[PDB]
Symmetry: D2
Subunit: 463 residues, 4 copies
């Protein structure tokens, strides 16, 4: 019946493609828990039409979920990325409502639930991850009412006015309510969920504000209670802090500045390419600052590192076209031959190279239109043990709830985005250090370990 007493369910297995374990991430965050539990991980291995035979990793048992390329297209590229993703992110792009996508999403979700049941021992603890798998908790509780089930959403949970658009709004809500604990990064998501529970499902809920890792909400579902909480994700702050101190990284950061023609100021953007990330906004702000002579085109350069994402989704292709136009435009207007003012890469950057960029950057531009947390904001902070740099951060990130000492911006307020970029570029050394010290105190004290433990303690208490 499966001999795992702790099970993680996520769209992907924690491996890279023969194959090896992916570095960092949740799987590393859960390392010391797997040392005391019989742990399993359920997910798609990332290859189409694979076996579903369990793979032993010593520390982990991997249960591959079989998906065809067609399953992936309709469940993932379709329903997950082109229905749920834009809807949950404040419909920045118009969601597509497609019944064939929904039906595949249901099937695939069931397949994940079945795989989980195979792995899970009696009374096992299950942690379901993220928006692609919102039906699993209910499906799992129906197959296996003995299980303790947690669910955490890594993206925002939208306001009810928007969520209601979903023709399958009730099925998704019922899906989440199959969990013992439903967690979000922010109290706002939790409160939206409680309100949805009363409005759409008619369940009795708690009415108080939801705290951070405390003051939990409750939804009554017949005989049982669903716990609702906010657990803001973070990074392995100490590890990144240590990694950024390496001599090789610091020398690379110096070499990067030399390769850029030794600018006095470097702005940096690091993003998975997504319309949620507000890359177009920072480029527009930068172009207008150059037009206004408020940024010196001779000693200031912007580096944007976009890692490719969701190429088969038309909205992402269109966003890529817009950004790339902006890059060519800005350089043609304000650059010189042999000296761009914008450097842009559309590719995955090796982790040590990326860290060197964090170390090199005088201003980190993290300006999403809407983002669940955004780890890049926290990664930059963790890397600046030298206390240099400046973080310009959108209010519409979960990170802005913790990183209040950054230069916060409303990305829709372009005038203030521009004022703020100038302010960050021209800050005094002391003021820069004051902010970075405060940000680091936060990020170092609130790491992924605290997050993981807080969620699992909450989940454990529902027993």
């Amino acid at each position: 019946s499966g001999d795992s007493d702790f099970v993680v369910v996520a769209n992907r297995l924690p491996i890279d493609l023969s194959w090896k374990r992916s570095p960092g991430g949740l799987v590393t965050a859960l390392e010391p828990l797997l040392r005391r539990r019989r742990g399993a991980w359920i997910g798609w291995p990332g290859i189409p039409d694979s076996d579903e035979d369990p793979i032993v990793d010593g520390d982990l048992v991997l249960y591959p979920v079989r998906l065809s390329a067609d399953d992936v297209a309709q469940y993932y590229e379709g329903f997950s990325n082109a229905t749920l993703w834009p809807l949950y992110h404040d419909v920045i792009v118009k969601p597509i409502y497609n019944r064939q996508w929904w039906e595949r999403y249901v099937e695939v979700n069931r397949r994940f639930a079945e795989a989980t049941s195979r792995a899970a021992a009696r009374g096992a603890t299950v942690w379901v991850q993220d928006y692609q798998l919102q039906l699993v908790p209910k499906m799992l509780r129906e197959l296996r009412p003995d299980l303790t089930i947690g669910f955490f959403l890594h993206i925002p949970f939208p306001p009810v006015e928007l969520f209601m658009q979903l023709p399958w709004r009730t099925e998704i809500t019922d899906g989440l309510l199959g969990a013992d604990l439903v967690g979000f990064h922010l109290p706002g998501g939790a409160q939206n969920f409680l309100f949805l529970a009363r409005r759409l499902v008619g369940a009795n809920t708690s009415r108080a504000s939801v705290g951070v890792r405390s003051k939990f909400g409750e939804v009554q579902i017949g005989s049982r209670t669903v716990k609702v909480g906010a657990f803001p994700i973070s990074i392995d702050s100490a590890d990144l802090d240590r990694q950024a101190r390496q001599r090789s990284i610091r020398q690379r950061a110096r070499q990067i500045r030399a390769e850029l023609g030794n600018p006095r100021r470097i702005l940096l953007g690091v993003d998975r390419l997504d319309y949620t990330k507000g890359i177009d906004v920072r480029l527009q702000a930068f172009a207008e600052l150059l037009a206004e002579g408020r940024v010196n085109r001779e000693d200031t350069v912007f580096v944007q590192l976009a890692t490719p994402s969701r190429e088969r989704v038309e909205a992402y292709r269109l966003l890529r076209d817009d950004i790339e136009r902006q890059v060519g435009h800005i350089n043609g207007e304000y650059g010189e031959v042999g000296h761009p003012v914008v450097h842009y890469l559309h590719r995955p950057v090796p982790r040590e190279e990326l860290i060197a960029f964090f170390v090199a950057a005088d201003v980190m531009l993290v300006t999403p239109l809407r983002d669940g947390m955004n780890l890049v904001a926290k990664e930059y902070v963790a890397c600046r043990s030298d206390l240099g740099g400046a973080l310009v951060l959108s209010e519409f990130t979960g990170a802005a709830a913790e990183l209040g000492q950054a230069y916060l911006v409303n990305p829709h307020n372009l005038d203030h985005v521009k004022d703020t970029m100038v302010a960050a570029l021209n800050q005094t050394p002391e003021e820069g250090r004051r902010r970075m010290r405060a940000l680091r105190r936060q990020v170092l004290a609130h790491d992924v370990d605290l997050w993981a433990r807080s969620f699992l303690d909450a989940l454990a208490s529902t027993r």
Copy 2:
């Protein structure tokens, strides 16, 4: 100092362009109150660069507000229609954030406040109308703290996640909080407003659900309390009921059906042209039903009457192009020469002609994506004293909160929109009558008089 003890403030004066009073509307709803008060109306006369000399109407004193064509472009076509309107309607279209529009909106709002102060006697009651004038209550209270000020929003008040986009979010919120009473059509708007008050402004508010014309919310603003309520607007039900019974109207309805080639079923759409109104959705549903042979192209016709709106706003021009494409397409595919399946007019229809269409229509299609109330739903119901017809109504209207006996649809769920249109077309006489009787009981009992009195009683109680 002005000798009016009751003052209405709205973007437009209640006149038609020399000039005469506009029929119906709020000005008719307030007729018996003006018989017992010295009443004034403040608004733009609809002509550019006019005098601001008061005009006596016997029952009313009209205070024209001077606006230039440029004022109208930036305050109205700009900020009101291309910033606030799309934002408040769940960003169906992308709002434009423009500082020049904001500054004009502020100036014009101040000009309205000044005009109000001129007209208003000491201790006068003021009722400010709608989204173009959200700054007036605060501006007015600053000029004239002796006044009792009510404000009613005729469009939805969006969720906080969306409202927060507005770079001038705080100024707008402070603006509304200048009122003694802030009213919305729905509890949902009221509750969004209270939540915004706590989150953005930090004011202490009530935490309970907001009732309908009862169980009011409260926002504490220093020394004074702001009342927050839901007052769902309606029509002069009895008057429209009476008007629809005229012999001439009923004969016209018969003649309309003959001019349409005597179809067995007529579907009707009546809308101010707006992307909020979901005209594209009903056309898509109709086209697919015809493709699927689920509607008989030989005996069923759809009439769409769009009255022109906001021609200088690009989004409205684009929507008009899309709808008109759909019309040509559907007729080219399923019509015959001499017999369209879709009749479409882009023009204002005389009121008696419009009522004849309500009487003629077997199915009323009211399918907005998002609408504050939508009066057309209620007008149709009021017209069907014969108890014929069927109302297909979007859940995303304020009207759907009262007209639950209609055929309710999620307009994003196209499959169900299509199922519902077939069901309404093919309903039994008895089932049709059962629904229409129940709808009429509601609409006849809850008219614009009840709405107006409920709001003003609430406003009066803040003294």
Copy 3:
């Protein structure tokens, strides 16, 4: 070796899909020649992956060419319709240059040549039809130097400045030069071909103007001479004339006018849907005339009958969208419920119904941007034995070279298109008759029989 002494090669067999002979067309025009020759027809049967076994029709032997759906996509929808077609029609739409399309076009052309060789007896006469098969004459002469080969292009032959764009310009030119006779509708095409022969291929040609069915051009290709001529295609004028006189047709024409609400004037457009046909132009002209009050929206109606074409080619889908927008727009602006000013059908009209429309129409609108001949202009004329009606005809048709008594227009000169439509609508009975009599004298004397005989006499003389 095949026992046919006269062979027609065309993209399609002359059949309809079991199957029966297509009415009218070239196959009917060649009926009395097949009575004195052993005739064969080579072409695709219109079904994918068919046999290539000959089919005896008594009067004809049909040699089916096997094509896969992929062959059709790349050779026909691709190279023929999306490379050659827009290029030859003055690049109204941007040609797509695709090497995979070219290679398939070559393969398919070879397959046609092989099929021809199978059917053709020693010394047989072969008539290759149109732009999809321009490589066949050279390929055929290489396989079978005993054959007499004619080729006729049914579309315009573009000026050299445009033809030169084609990366495979030389291969196409060499292809055509494989024929003993290369014929075009117009001297202009013939002269373009001669000039191309000198410029691109370097062959010695004649330098005189090319006559109509006379004064032929010559291209010297080593040992042999290629004849170049103009043979303007026509219709079976006498048959259509006779058909239009039927009592049933005339009664249908009257019934059509009654079904249109008995307009005083009917304008008609009849076209295979194509961006070459200038349907968008006549709609624009009509809309502006209505806007200007120069056409009476109360007693004048426009009927447009578009038969579907090339749905898998994006440019045709886009044109359909534009036209259909125009239709919806014009009706929404100038129509009434129950009375459109534009009736539009996107569907094949039965031949007797179409003829009834020709008979009913007061003004025939034939306004292509560029058209090889356009048979509709001549069909209308043939149908008006009552001498009623008016033909408005684009100068950029081959038909305008013969139908000079029509109301000729430059479709790019919209002001004059509009003036001309008013003039045609309001012509005196006598002036209308004078033009229609002259047009009919032309069309009745120059029919498809004269065309076919003239081409084949020219082809025969090369022996």
Copy 4:
């Protein structure tokens, strides 16, 4: 009556904006003729609403033509740049036919003719320049039949099938026929003009091919004959040759290569931004070569220098957007931070800097879709006295008729454009020198002086 016996008429005066004479160009080419004649120049000074008082330059008398910003918009940006320009260049972009533009073009042309008459002495020689002023010769001959009038078109003269689109085709043709000599860069243009003369105007013309600076064509216009010829424009080859040899230029070329990260190969594009210039084609070719690994992204760089043009014309803005997208795209895909594979400037480059780029570039990419001559091809050749470099040149330039030793390409044949770019990048030193020597022999022997003298000798012989 004006005391100038030689008069140049062009859209612009030969000055830069107080003001000074523009370097190089036609005005320098005509320097030794002005030393023996009383010369005048008629044109717009480039400022709106100026005086028309003559300005003495000692060597020249400048007659400013008064134009308002509105005149410029409708005559120049409108008719010239958005009607004639796309039409004459094979409708790469769709011409706009606008009667208001035409009427302004007529008025402005008349104003130029009047200014000319003011300056011109009895029996004076007049040289009218280019496509904005095609009506002047007829207008001038009507005012002043004593004048000898030449006209030269600097852009291609399109084939008749395209020219015929122009609603004002006859007025333009009559306009040109007002000249004693009409000259084009190429025999092809001359021959198109003769054919147009016979077809549209019905004039008797010569029928032979038109030679280069010889074997002239003739159009008979009543009593007088119009000479038609081909005079391919060139540059001051010797001066540019000398200029490129300067030590400072050669050092700058070396410094440019160092600033580019010392690539082994530099490709260069230099163009006035125009959709005729095929900048999008070379970028596409370069991107695909990089994708295919046929160009080394580590040691090969492309520099594109676009100088801004016609910003108020939407087609030019759209082309700029497309190019700039391509630049950003290619760099994001194949560049490195600190090392773009494409450098792009949208700005006027100082002449000495531009020459340094010619000297630095290993491959010159001159790939227009259609261009009258293209001087950049010849400028590059003149600069390479070191015999290094390679010229990749579109067949669809007038320059390709003289520069046959370059690497000629059909820009529509992208496969061959790509093959050719690889071939040019990888040519042997010797083969490179062989081509460059031959090209230089041509360009050095056929300079702007030969062109100017040949045209004026032809013009003089019509006396």
